[PDB]
Amino acid sequence: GVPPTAELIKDEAGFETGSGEPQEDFVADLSVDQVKQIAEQKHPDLLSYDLTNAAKEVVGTCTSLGVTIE
Amino acid sequence: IPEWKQEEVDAIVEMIESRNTLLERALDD
């Protein structure tokens, strides 16, 4: 249904492509609140019960591309 | 006497309180 993660990030990230090497080459950043919203757009695609866990899932594709958090 | 089998029994007993062998083991407590 609702679009995939990779893209939802590249939107509120302000960039288009990832980094040749993740966690090593930080391409973009994301406030916690920003990740709190994405986790809301994917409420159906995710198995988690509480929003807390839903984040860990989303918060898993970021640092793996150079998407630090604040 | 694996440690995980012990942590499981106690883990099960914790849910009951509030592998078949492990379930039985717990129930027996």
Next chain:
RNA sequence: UCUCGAGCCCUAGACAGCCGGGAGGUGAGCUUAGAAGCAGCUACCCUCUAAGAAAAGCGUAACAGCUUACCGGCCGAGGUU
């Protein structure tokens, strides 16, 4: 094929076999017209859970599909190095 010894696993059910499960984010990011476990490069993280890899081997033009891992059941006594 006979005999002697050591280590580890096992009735909290071992070894093997058979049955059932092997799931979501997500077909990871990059590269590329495309690549979705499985061309190559890099990373290899977390949910549900009794399990289930950013996938060990085949398979496809790429999917699909078939299995290993991993978990559960049936079984019941030694098994393995």
